Write a protein that binds this ligand. Structure first.
Ligand SMILES: Nc1nc2c(ncn2[C@@H]2O[C@H](COP(=O)(O)OP(=O)(O)O)[C@@H](O)[C@H]2O)c(=O)[nH]1
Ligand SMILES: Nc1nc2c(ncn2[C@@H]2O[C@H](COP(=O)(O)OP(=O)(O)O)[C@@H](O)[C@H]2O)c(=O)[nH]1
Ligand SMILES: Nc1nc2c(ncn2[C@@H]2O[C@H](COP(=O)(O)OP(=O)(O)O)[C@@H](O)[C@H]2O)c(=O)[nH]1
Ligand SMILES: Nc1nc2c(ncn2[C@@H]2O[C@H](COP(=O)(O)OP(=O)(O)O)[C@@H](O)[C@H]2O)c(=O)[nH]1
Ligand SMILES: [Mg+2]
Ligand SMILES: [Mg+2]
Ligand SMILES: [Mg+2]
Ligand SMILES: [Mg+2]
Ligand SMILES: [Mg+2]
Ligand SMILES: [Mg+2]
Ligand SMILES: [Mg+2]
Ligand SMILES: [Mg+2]
Ligand SMILES: [Mg+2]
Ligand SMILES: [Mg+2]
Ligand SMILES: [Mg+2]
Lengths: 372, 372, 372, 372
């Protein structure tokens, strides 16, 4: 028996419920919708309507949310007017003992009846399994899709590695593997960065390449759009706070890029694995303000390659995801001071130090919950 | 006979002279090299050598240049440590009565023996010829090239027109046209923005499209890397001063994007035309830090769409290029106050205002030369 | 005989109308209150209350305001949510033909029944009279007041001249002078800059020193809080738009520091003079977050010394204030390119260029009224 | 025997040693001079000559310093081109077991022959002695001086407490106290902030009030210009790294305002005390870019009142200065997320988190020297 919770944060009126509730309803999944201060009241009605239609959906008011965060002594941890409020659902689903947490946006739509069943691969045991390795340490999950205009990389894929990646050796081998994170893919508008979207407005047409499980030492970015996490890894799945300036420019839109690398680094350290493939969602093409998305994403892009290079070198400690995550936060602070380059001004260094304190303030709430 | 001056600014040894002298020397072309402060002394030795071998090359000392500018009462117009120093070559070539000024980068190699002769297309006069018009006002000169990975747009091409551009209709009709700007294309690393370079890393394989002369009302960005300008249009070809911050971030790398749009706009006002196609140069793909290029171009890219929209609507006065350019400078200043959007903070608005003054200080310089 | 209009912008209740109204009503002077988008509607009640009670007050809506700025072709010249909207009062007052425009803040209250009559000193015409000069080119109007902790300088006084000022020689000659600006002083909280207020929180106990008329070449900042301008000078009294960044930090609180210097430099070019002294208002200590005031003024303060220096060496052209003001606006554009210092980054020079355009937009609006 | 080491970091020619070497040579004090990347080669000359006349002065090369910082595992702790290098002097003098470290600026000259001896008050122990308490929590050490124009506060004195401070009641009571920090005063140009120096340019003519020892809960800023620290307190005296932006603006010139408060807060936690009074140095008026000093200090000034207020409500832990300092670093991180106010942009909050990490890097290096 696998208890599953889907976490969404929305400032919509609740319409996404209509087409999203079926696959969760028929599967008996709980749906946590996290409203914000800028969430109009229609959302709450839409929930009680769908609860009446058989879906186990809850939707805690901001006042409820803040009460919980206040009792766990993390009152300022999670801002309002942010999709950071994600973290509230992660915490609630974990508090309540769910095995599988599925992180979604309110615009992603499952495309198959077995959406929940497939994300439950993260509840498989360890298995001798085909594992996918790349000579250069990276795997491009968009390679599993038919993408119309031209080949593309996912958002958060490092840039320095892209030119040579196509010449890298990809190998499949049977090894023991214990999947704890399932990153399901997306059709229509795929999770590419604002650079790529602006340059080729790609269209993901089909899921053609199956699924994969990345060998130790092979990484690919994991987003929070269509992603199952096993309850043991949830401590390392903290969605990072955006807004910190790099060279004076505030970063946005990369909170789940850090999180999807962090949970992934921790998992490998603990002998666990990340899977990419089904189930796939439908991500509609939002067509809003691509130049603004670029302006938001550039500060993080200017830092990520260096942060990812330094994480490889850095050995971690811990015997579960909380301890390893805490050790990681200290490593980021050592990296914040060791890294070098034009993007690394005082505010850019300081962004790491603040993020590390917020990561331990998060685990600290998980301990308070657990009496640790 | 038609007299031509190639203008190149550089901070290098002069080794580029070796593969660039042949075409110039055999045509009797003048090569103006603008050295900078951060320019080693090898270059000056390199020129004297090639001069001895027959190439009519000149290499005015920083001290020479600065005396010209003082004597013209524009001592602060042209910054140091910047490829803005092209402008001295432009001025020197104008001052000495050259018919055709070709703007180049020190790293662009001619690929044919009649390089100079082809750029003299700007010296044929008006005639009825095949003219190319687009239903959306834009032409994509990169479509005249076979580009390796996927279709691309040139640097400076507005972003709001890209998605729909493939659906515009293109017509070729016999109209009178007076070509005064010839933007030759590039094999290798084509002139795309940082966004496009990062996303697809395009390779320009061949110039298979022939040449086009853009109808009135159809525009395409014009760069300063492989571009001939008839001396009457030179006064509107001032390479814009970069470094003005947009919302805090200093813009760079777009001096010729504004200059190419400004000389085009003035040309069409005066009933002249821009040609795209041959002669072709090879542009070697030496990238280094693409992410820094991106950080530099984004501030200009955030304003350019709006600047272009207001330029389509803004009627200009003037009978020659100098009159029309000054009228454009005042138009930019009206636009600075009418435009609206998230990117148009006070420092973005003031950018246009200081550019406008710089533009008229340049034309004041040319006026002084011509009044004496 | 002499028509007088007072000009005040306010986001208040209209409460100040209370006690400000007497001195103006008995003198039958027009009071023009310019409300803003962020102003209360209680204000308009106050207005027509007094209009019954005998005071010729007129406080027009944002819409009438915008109607006029539209009919004068300057619909973007005066922003909202900013005391810059004084300028609407200046223009209306000029338009209607008042002889004497008195600029006030809504927290300054006359202290004598002759308030309007003392400000009318500006319609005396040329008459031989005592005139004061300082060998260093500066006069400290605060030395006309008794100030509580120690000696102070008015806001806008150049910092480089402060240490030596006590050793400058002051001299008085009787000579012909035509007073067109009357800058009356302040008791209670004197108009000092944020630096001074923070350091010594001065209190101006009395007006001990009588009045002075400054000789040509002798300057002192003039504010818009208790300052009478003669109709002919009002063209040059345009209140400068704040908000431009200097090194990324936007300036504020100095719109009238520039206008007071600009009207003054124009006046002296035309052979007119500035007076300081009676009538005295009371300015209540409303010290509201002095550190914020400091953070706002510092950008402007880092430029002003250099601006005043270059203004001394820049001779102007014009036969009236409009012409001279426009000549000034162009001098500033030269100065913006000639000056040097660490504060003179690209956005700080662009401040001068956008301001010059805004000043010529203001004179263009008045030309429109007059038929140039 | 009481061993004393004076620490100075300089970029000067070494001329200051003429007027400093006597009072220290006479006392057999060691003088540690920390040069920087940008220190002339003359300064090394000066040191060698001054040792030839008996001054035990040492001037370690930047290569020498960097070897020690690498061996302590802190190669990146202390930047170059910064008076932060002070810290190297503290570390060297603490390593060598000096009882008393006297932190100086290279332009602070002793006015008495008992300079060293007087600073040795820090090495007498606890005893019952006159102890000064203030009803408001603050003591203005400049009140011990005769100041020429008017009353002033020292650099780093909170701004909210200044208006009401003259109304505070001060008492002197016999109480046990243990003086571990001695802040000697300054004649000539007192240690004022840029605000004050610009406003009134104070001249400190005499030391008239004797010396005081502050009761628990009464604070006053302590600078690093003329300040003796006992051995045990040096771990808490790390001179804080400047350069972090507050709302885009880099803070500077306040490294010792923080250190002076951090050491003071640790001292009182440990039941130790701060002294103000003799001995006195002459601080010659330097007069250099005061508007730049102001631009540099304002960002720190915008945060300091809030930090101090939060420090009063934050209980610490530790049984020595290392432990108490590390405890303080963690309290700053909590404060960084609790404080509220306009200046508290993300970069300003992250400023505290990066500082705390550098504080713990500094204590870590001290622990490595001690094997603890
Ligand atoms: N709590 C909260 N959620 C938000 C906010 N803004 C966006 N979201 C949620 O974020 C998710 C998708 O965000 P979006 O901005 O549409 O990014 P895009 O699809 O990658 O371009 C959806 O679940 C939205 O409801 C906000 O201010 N507060
Ligand atoms: N005067 C001057 N020229 C420069 C400077 N930096 C680069 N250049 C020249 O600028 C032109 C192209 O520069 P590059 O950085 O190679 O960019 P790319 O045009 O995008 O390939 C070449 O002619 C260089 O010689 C500089 O600081 N001063
Ligand atoms: N129209 C308008 N007037 C304002 C605004 N803010 C302040 N004022 C006016 O500013 C005047 C007083 O100046 P203030 O900036 O408040 O402080 P002070 O310069 O230190 O005296 C009053 O007459 C207010 O009505 C605003 O947003 N819009
Ligand atoms: N190592 C180092 N020391 C510096 C630097 N700039 C100033 N100092 C030292 O700082 C001390 C005081 O410097 P000063 O410029 O006089 O600042 P002020 O007294 O606060 O106005 C002197 O001993 C200088 O030698 C620097 O870049 N590197
Ligand atoms: Mg989405
Ligand atoms: Mg598993
Ligand atoms: Mg993720
Ligand atoms: Mg190049
Ligand atoms: Mg032609
Ligand atoms: Mg050009
Ligand atoms: Mg006020
Ligand atoms: Mg008169
Ligand atoms: Mg004024
Ligand atoms: Mg000094
Ligand atoms: Mg100190």
């Amino acid at each position: 028996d696998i208890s599953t919770a889907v976490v969404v944060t929305t400032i919509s009126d609740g319409g996404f419920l209509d087409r999203l509730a079926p696959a969760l309803r028929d599967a008996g999944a709980r749906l946590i919708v996290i409203p914000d201060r800028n969430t109009g009241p229609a959302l709450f009605a839409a929930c009680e309507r769908h609860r009446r239609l058989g879906l186990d959906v809850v939707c805690p008011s901001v006042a409820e949310q803040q009460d919980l965060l206040e009792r766990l002594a993390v009152p300022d941890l999670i801002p309002y007017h942010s999709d950071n409020r994600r973290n509230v659902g992660y915490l609630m689903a974990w508090m309540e003992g769910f095995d599988v947490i599925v992180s979604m946006d309110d615009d992603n739509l499952p495309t198959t009846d077995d959406f929940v069943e497939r994300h439950q691969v993260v509840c498989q045991g360890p298995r001798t399994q085909p594992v996918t390795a790349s000579s250069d340490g990276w795997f491009n999950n968009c390679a599993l899709l038919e993408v119309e205009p031209t080949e593309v990389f996912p958002r958060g894929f490092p840039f320095h590695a892209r030119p040579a990646h196509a010449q890298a050796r990809t190998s499949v081998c049977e090894r023991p593997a214990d999947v704890r994170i399932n990153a399901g893919l997306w059709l229509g508008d795929p999770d590419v960065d604002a650079i790529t979207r602006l340059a080729v407005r790609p269209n993901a047409l089909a899921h053609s390449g199956g699924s994969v499980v990345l060998a130790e030492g092979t990484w690919c970015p994991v987003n929070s759009q269509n992603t199952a996490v096993h309850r043991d890894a949830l401590p390392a799945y903290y969605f990072l706070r955006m807004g910190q300036p790099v060279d004076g420019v505030p970063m946005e839109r990369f909170g789940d890029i850090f999180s999807g690398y962090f949970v992934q680094v921790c998992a490998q350290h603990l002998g666990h694995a990340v899977r990419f493939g089904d189930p796939v969602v439908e991500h509609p093409r939002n067509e809003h303000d691509l130049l603004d998305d670029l302006h938001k994403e550039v500060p993080a892009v200017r830092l990520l390659d260096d942060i990812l290079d330094h994480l490889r070198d850095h050995p971690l400690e811990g015997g579960d995801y909380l301890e390893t995550y805490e050790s990681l936060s200290y490593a980021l602070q050592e990296i914040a001071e060791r890294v070098n380059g034009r993007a690394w001004s005082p505010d850019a260094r300081a962004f790491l130090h603040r993020s590390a304190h917020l990561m331990r303030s998060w685990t600290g709430a998980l301990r308070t919950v657990a009496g640790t």
